[PDB]
Amino acid sequence: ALQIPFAMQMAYRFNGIGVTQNVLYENQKLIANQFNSAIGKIQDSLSSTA
Amino acid sequence: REGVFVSNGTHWFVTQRNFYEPQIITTDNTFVSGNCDVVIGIVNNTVYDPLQPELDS
Numbered sequence: 001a002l003q004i005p006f007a008m009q010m011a012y013r014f015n016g017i018g019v020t021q022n023v024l025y026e027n028q029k030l031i032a033n034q035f036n037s038a039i040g041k042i043q044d045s046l047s048s049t050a
Numbered sequence: 051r052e053g054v055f056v057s058n059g060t061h062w063f064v065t066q067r068n069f070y071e072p073q074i075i076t077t078d079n080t081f082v083s084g085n086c087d088v089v090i091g092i093v094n095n096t097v098y099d100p101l102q103p104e105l106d107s
């Protein structure tokens with residue numbers, strides 16, 4: 001395991017889908033909001049959908 | 051452009067991700083986008099431009 005800052009791991013996930021890494025850094029707060037809000041929907045999905 | 055910015059503590063360099071090979075940071079092995087305000091954790095350092103000394107010829 002090599003440590004790396006998490007926002008730099010995500011940039012090297014983004015380059016792997018062909019989106020240029022500056023698209024992450026110019027939108028990092030927005031991406032954190034979308035990711036955090038998306039896991040909120042998982043808890044609601046599992047809590048509602050037995 | 052490809053690789054990671056890294057520092058030993060005072061020198062700044064860029065390397066490929068999978069084997070340490072420290073290049074000097076330049077207008078060739080980097081690309082610009084936007085102003086310094088937006089990015090979290092950006093650092094102040096000089097980026098070299100190889101054309102400059104040739105126009106100083």
Ligand SMILES: *[C@@H]1O[C@H](CO)[C@@H](O)[C@H](O)[C@H]1NC(C)=O
Pocket residue numbers: 090091
């Ligand atoms: C990294 O963590 C330190 C506290 O240990 C904090 O002062 C610093 O602002 C953080 N840097 C970034 C880029 O978030």
Ligand SMILES: *[C@@H]1O[C@H](CO)[C@@H](O)[C@H](O)[C@H]1NC(C)=O
Pocket residue numbers: 094
């Ligand atoms: C980076 O450089 C600019 C221009 O000299 C300066 O305004 C800014 O305060 C510097 N940032 C840091 C973290 O020192």
